[PDB]
Design a binder for this molecule. Structure first.
Ligand SMILES: O=c1ccn([C@H]2C[C@H](O)[C@@H](CO)O2)c(=O)[nH]1
Ligand SMILES: [Zn+2]
Length: 111
């Protein structure tokens, strides 16, 4: 529907690893963008994706402090460089699983 789009793929900002695509953004509670803080007070602009790749999911899930009701999280690192890119979420409903990735740790560009 658009020739030569420059904004279709998300890659790891620190190394280039393919991570997700704009077509895979997922509006959780009506918005694909959720702004949250961890217990250390860090603010994150979290983009929700249905699907992602090139990550490494660390350990087992935890429900503690989850920003998304009904889901447990696993830390998602870039599988190539180890940069912490976000979290994989599971154990919930409609959808069962998704990714919440930290927007400013990704780079957007052409396929
Ligand atoms: O939904 C989530 C996912 C992660 N964290 C925090 C917990 C932990 O301190 C750190 C792990 O990335 O992020 C949350 O607060 N909520
Ligand atoms: Zn990386």
């Amino acid at each position: 529907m658009v020739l030569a789009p420059g904004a279709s793929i998300f890659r790891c900002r620190q190394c280039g690893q393919t991570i997700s695509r704009r077509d895979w953004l997922l509006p959780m509670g009506g918005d694909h963008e959720h702004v949250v803080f961890n217990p250390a007070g860090m603010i994150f602009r979290v983009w929700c994706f249905s699907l992602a790749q090139g990550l490494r999911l660390i350990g087992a899930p935890s429900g503690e402090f989850s920003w998304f009701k009904g889901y447990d999280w696993t830390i998602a690192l870039c599988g190539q460089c180890g940069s912490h890119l976000g979290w994989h979420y599971e154990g919930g409903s409609q959808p069962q699983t998704f990714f919440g990735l930290i927007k400013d740790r990704l780079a957007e560009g052409p396929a």
